[PDB]
Paper text:
The 39-subunit U4/U6.U5 tri-[name] is the largest preassembled building block of the spliceosome, which joins the splicing pathway at the precatalytic (pre-B) stage and delivers two components of the RNA catalytic core, the U5 and U6 snRNAs, in their inactive configurations requiring further remodeling. [name] is a hallmark protein of the 20S U5 [name], absent from the mature tri-[name]. Here we report a high-resolution cryogenic electron microscopy structure of the 20S U5 [name], shedding light on the mutually exclusive interfaces utilized during tri-[name] assembly and the role of the [name] in facilitating this process.
At least three major states are present in our 20S U5 [name] reconstruction. State II is missing two helicases, BRR2 and [name], and may represent an earlier stage of the U5 [name] assembly. State III contains particles missing the Sm ring, most probably damaged during the vitrification process. In all reconstructions, PRP8 provides the scaffold for the entire complex and interacts with multiple other subunits. We observed two well-defined densities located near PRP8RT/En and PRP8Nterm domains, which were assigned to [name] domains D1 (62-130) and D2 (150-233), respectively. A hook-shaped extension of the CD2BP2D1 bridges the PRP8RT/En and PRP8Nterm domains and probably stabilizes their relative orientation, which differs from the one observed in the tri-[name]. We could not locate DIM1 in our map, but we observed some additional, low-resolution density near [name], which most probably belongs to DIM1/CD2BP2GYF. Our cross-linking mass spectrometry (XL-MS) data detect DIM1–CD2BP2GYF and 40K–CD2BP2GYF interactions consistent with this putative location.
Numbering used by the authors:
A (entry chain l): 14 to 90
B (entry chain j): 10 to 77, 87 to 116
C (entry chain h): 6 to 50, 61 to 88
D (entry chain C): 105 to 951
E (entry chain A): 224 to 362, 369 to 501
F (entry chain n): 3 to 76
G (entry chain k): 1 to 84
Amino acid sequence: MVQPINLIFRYLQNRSRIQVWLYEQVNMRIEGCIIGFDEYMNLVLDDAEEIHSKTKSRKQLGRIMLKGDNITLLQSV
Amino acid sequence: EMTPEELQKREEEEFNTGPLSVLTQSVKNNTQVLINCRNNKKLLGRVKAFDRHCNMVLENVKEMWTEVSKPVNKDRYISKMFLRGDSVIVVLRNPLIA
Amino acid sequence: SSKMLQHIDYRMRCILQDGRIFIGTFKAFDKHMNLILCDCDEFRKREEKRVLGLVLLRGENLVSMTVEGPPPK
Amino acid sequence: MEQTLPVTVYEMDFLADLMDNSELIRNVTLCGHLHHGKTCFVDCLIEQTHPEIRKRYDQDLCYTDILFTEQERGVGIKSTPVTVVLPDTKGKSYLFNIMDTPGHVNFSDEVTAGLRISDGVVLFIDAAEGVMLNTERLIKHAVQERLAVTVCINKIDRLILELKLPPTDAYYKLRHIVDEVNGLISMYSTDENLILSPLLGNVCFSSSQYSICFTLGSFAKIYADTFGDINYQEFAKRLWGDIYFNPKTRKFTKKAPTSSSQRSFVEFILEPLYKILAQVVGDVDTSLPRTLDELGIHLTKEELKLNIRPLLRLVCKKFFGEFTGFVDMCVQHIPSPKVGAKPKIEHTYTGGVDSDLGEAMSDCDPDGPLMCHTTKMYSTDDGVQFHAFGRVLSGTIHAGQPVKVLGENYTLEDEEDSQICTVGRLWISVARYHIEVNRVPAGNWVLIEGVDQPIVKTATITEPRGNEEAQIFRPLKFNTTSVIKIAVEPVNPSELPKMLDGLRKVNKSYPSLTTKVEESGEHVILGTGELYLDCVMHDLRKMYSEIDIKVADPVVTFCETVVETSSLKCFAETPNKKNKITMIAEPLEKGLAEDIENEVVQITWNRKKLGEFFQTKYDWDLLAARSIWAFGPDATGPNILVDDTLPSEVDKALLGSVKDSIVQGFQWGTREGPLCDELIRNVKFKILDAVVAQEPLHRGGGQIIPTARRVVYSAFLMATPRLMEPYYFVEVQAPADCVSAVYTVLARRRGHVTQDAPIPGSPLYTIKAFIPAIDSFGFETDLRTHTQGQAFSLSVFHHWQIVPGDPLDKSIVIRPLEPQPAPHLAREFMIKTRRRKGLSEDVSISK
Amino acid sequence: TYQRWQFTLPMMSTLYRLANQLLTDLVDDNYFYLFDLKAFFTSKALNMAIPGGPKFEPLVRDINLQDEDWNEFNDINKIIIRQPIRTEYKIAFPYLYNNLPHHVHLTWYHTPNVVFIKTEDPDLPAFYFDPLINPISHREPLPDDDEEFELPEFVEPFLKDTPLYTDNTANGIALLWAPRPFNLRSGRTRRALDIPLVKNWYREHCPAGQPVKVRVSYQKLLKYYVLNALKHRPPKAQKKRYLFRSFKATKFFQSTKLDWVEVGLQVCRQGY
Amino acid sequence: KAHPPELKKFMDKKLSLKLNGGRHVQGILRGFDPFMNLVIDECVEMATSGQQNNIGMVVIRGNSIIMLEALERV
Amino acid sequence: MSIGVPIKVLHEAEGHIVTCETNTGEVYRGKLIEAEDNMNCQMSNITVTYRDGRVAQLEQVYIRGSKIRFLILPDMLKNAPMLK
RNA sequence: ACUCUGGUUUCUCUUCAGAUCGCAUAAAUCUUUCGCACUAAAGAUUUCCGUGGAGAGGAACAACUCUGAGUCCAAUUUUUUGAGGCCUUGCUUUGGCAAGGCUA
Ligand SMILES: Nc1nc2c(ncn2[C@@H]2O[C@H](COP(=O)(O)OP(=O)(O)OP(=O)(O)O)[C@@H](O)[C@H]2O)c(=O)[nH]1
């Protein structure tokens, strides 16, 4: 059985282009390279970029720290 | 928690060195504080006491709210009231105009 | 928490976060504020009564409650 | 509903609404060896669901031994149903239908009548004694009837307070008991999913006297409740077997840290229990309050003044609480009526599970066709009218509703035994008091009034004007055979009808009582032993007929057999003298009569499989092996009928017109037998030349059947006839010193000792021996008197063996009132049974 | 007023050891099988005598063993005799072995054997695998050790500082199997004359080898034991009226506290 | 004292998940924790636009978990 | 002092037919299979009604406790041992 | 965791007690039975040896052990927020309500 924490650690080791969903913000999606996590689900993305659904404008945010209380679902690629 | 000690005084350290120390400036110097509410309202007053939850009590608070007609800012005066910390968006001390 | 024990078995009306009104015999409550009301009826506004029975409403959904009728026999 | 009742923890409306949810119902039977603690299991349970019903300090109120003879005799004599709402470990409530069965080896028919209507079994196993005669017998019976088995190792205080074993050796004793049970289960069952282990929740540990009852999960939940942070379900998986606690790393390993380290069960479960008991019984004045403070138990000062046994009961009650390990065990491992309705129909319904009614019943749907099956009949104290007791397998029985009671001989073409009746009232039966209800849905047990007239032993109760093709449930198959035999007659012969009516009433009471009227106008009762027949006569005299009844000396039923093949082939012609049959008789091969009786083989099998069996198992050629015609006096009686008539010698097709009559003649003539009108056992009848008359008006009917019977008799008589004695299997538990006295007592009654062996962890011994059933009356009294009460035996029917002598020998001179030497026991047994049956003085050996 | 005693267990053990020369040292009531009150009741009602027990006189004149004719029922030519039907067999099963049984008090059946292993050394553990106990001949969905179950830091077996056995655990278990009053720890006082010290001596089996006078004495003691138990009438309801209190209420009597012997001489002379 | 959610019956089974923002998901469960966060293998987006997008190994926070539906027979 | 009376009423409600209302306005009615300390219920044979009113059948589910707004327990439970 | 009942011992009196009222077990009278009544049984009545329950009075020291009663939690799952803003329709109690579509 794969644990969410183990999966997050594996993704951080791989440093894949993790795309994270938003809580209640369906249109706004954020992709980035996972660097580290915490017990509060706080994630840090090296090369962050916000992707919209109606505008679809990829705006680079750089090194950002997304709170765990707002993330919805972490996807690769 | 790694600090289950009964003599828990770290709450005051955050009130002196952490982000919560800003409210301590308003408590000590008695400076006007403007806080943005989750209901799209702004209240300007003077906070007397608070806690880790951010629930503070303000005295002589002026509340501003915009209602649309077009958005027009309405003002109400309050002598004193208690505001929940979780029901606030941002709290900032009044800037020094001079 | 005797403030709610004195209201046990009383037919009370509860105002929810979504605006729904639940009138029924308040049976028990917990620290989480979960409401256990029996022979409950749902009141919504167009007025309409929707009888439910034993109602287990979560504490988060609890907003305000007031006594509507004395406990029955 | 409107009946005055003792106060309960629950409320009767909750009980009434639990009956409609057949996933919250558990139909359980409690069983075990005698005195292994079942009664107070339910009693201590009735206490916890009945706050005002409290056991007397110095005397246990058995509350399930409700009768009179049970009360002073101190044996369980009848099964008694109990219905209780019992909470679970997680606080959920289930409706338990518990059947409390007796543990005497004589009264096993009550156990089968309780196993029929149950979905699971709880076997009670005294922790000091261990696995005894009835434990093994009930294990066999309960895995045969396809019930889910759990185990309660009761009386575990005896390990602490009597044997005083070190906690580790108590652990070894419990593990040994569990292993014995597992071995028996695997002996009597192919599939492996009946593995019993306290790691599966399958085994419960208890001490009913002191209100102890736990599984591993409930004890781990005691820990979890006190120290809140442990997950009691994963704790429970580390509390048995060779798994040790490593207190430095706080982890459970499979290898003991260093040495002198205790297993997890000893360390975490058994040492605390030893220490509670030792503190209470030894240090009650000195340091009991400190440990009761440690455990969080506070006894009022008027309670620390209690005697040591009530104090121990109260302390253990406070620490443990309710019997939620029992409820956990039964809810997890005993199926609900809904889930266990498929094996029930598969096993006990004559219509097969594939029938449409065998489908509407296998859902346990309480809105379907009514199908209620009653196995017990409980008599109102006035002794006039009975109340049937069974379970509703489908539909719903209502008070006042007219029902159609089907007997045991009812078939779909012979519909004369069914009878319309009118249900009067319906009681949910707790042990002592009946709770009258208005309806009982499917999956529940009900006490019915109004259907008591047309049923003798068991019934299938259905609906009239519907259910047009509703067959019956198979009649109970019992553990034993009824062999002991007494004859009765009223003192004043003017009141014979009163005694006949009383005999009918006792026949209703006892599930395996068999009262018959012999040819001589003599009324006979068949029973299992001395306690059984003593209680039957007690009831007959004092309850059902209030007259004075004489009792004959106890005797046994015999059986007749042969020991070679008939010398000259015998024959018999019809009175027409055109039909001629010819037979010879020889003894069945060793170990085949049991296969025929124990349904290892049936004649319902196709000829191919039957022949294949006989071939591979007893060296039969395909010709004869497929030539079998019938099987014994029954459909499964221990006799065969073979046709060796060659197709060339006799027209096989023409012979087939008298097969159906030769079979009947053989069945009847094996049912009676020529020697003393006893059954024939272990005899093979080969036909040799059946000259058949072509004229159908000359053969068939009342012409050929008696000819078949007479040739059967003659063929049996030309092979050397013998008699047969029922042999009893005696198990005795006696101290090591009184073991030799057991040998001394046995040898005077033709008894032969198979084995004596110690009881592991117990100071006692078990002597197992075989004794003739006739040489057994007073054997229990002889053994318990010669040993000053220190030796005790339960004896049960085992096999049929040949009486030493030769029954057909007139050279033997028998005096009227003295015991014979063995050389001619058979002759006496034959002629005295002839005299008692009313037949002639001696046989007429002829053709 | 001396009407109730509350004792500790080290006192009850000491009183139990001292009395042992007067004590039976059984652990059961299986010794008294077919030799107990109910058995003697039944034997009296059936007009028979258990060998070693009381012999009463016929309860009621009725039919006799030489008064019933031959019938076809009880014909002695239909009867198989293997072992004679003793009278104990008619006491043990009073309804199977007996025509017209009345007043048959059903005897108590078995009682599970007590396997209390009596201790011999005070210098042995209380819980100890005695040599009188037959050995247990030695010979599992457990989870793997690597499974991540950890018992929290402040969790230990329930009573862990409490020692398993104390210096009065062996003695306080032996008190469970003691004869009353030693299986008590509190109770109500009796009068000195209400305590028979040998009533449990002659309720035992008639001893073999003693001369006939002793055995007849045993059975004669048992006869009056059974008659006392059977003819017992409940004490009638009344109003407490005490004679000597009425004596003291009047002015004619007075009180002192004398030696017993002095009052013995007084009573002797007074009666004279 | 966070007892793990009772989800062993749905382990390695095709399940449909409901998103907080009216979203829907699909995939095969692979594990869970006391916070209810689930790891799903062979995840299918199943967006409201009608086009199903396959992702694979994804992690979903328990806060946004709205409801679980076992597509496969359990 | 740990589990409230509503918790016991909800736990004992397993087995009967229960209707749960979620924060998303979806009503699921079915036979409860198991319930935990939290409101997390794993119902079965659920007739699901959407906000617009569409009716759907769901054989197996696991309702998230946080999203459960209010539920209607079976009428039989009104005489439960815990609720008395 | 703060306050208030209830005590125990002893002497006397009144009433009920079929409850092993007593973990003991006497005597008398009457009847019946048979012997032919210490050496014998059954039934009934009585008296004695002496107990429990309740109630009542007296008089001796303990008074709050006990019995009860009144008197440390902001980071998913409940109480320290995804909250607030835009559009249409029916009715507007012209305040807006109801549903849906949205933006955050
Ligand atoms: N030592 C000990 N004795 C017990 C225990 N439970 C019951 N007994 C006693 O053992 C005997 C068993 O009697 P019951 O429990 O009525 O017997 P049973 O198991 O119902 O069996 P049957 O007599 O066939 O009905 C009685 O003397 C009980 O008091 C126990 O846990 N420990």
